[PDB]
């Protein structure tokens, strides 16, 4: 499985694969 986190940075090891809104801010969505 693959697990994402919406983040304001992604980790190193996190790939940044699109936006992720939250609480209306910008945020980027961060997989590995
Ligand atoms: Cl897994
Ligand atoms: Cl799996």
Given at each position: ?32
């Amino acid at each position: 499985a693959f697990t994402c986190h919406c983040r304001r940075s992604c980790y190193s090891t996190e790939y940044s694969y699109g936006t992720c809104t939250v609480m209306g801010i910008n945020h980027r969505f961060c997989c590995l």
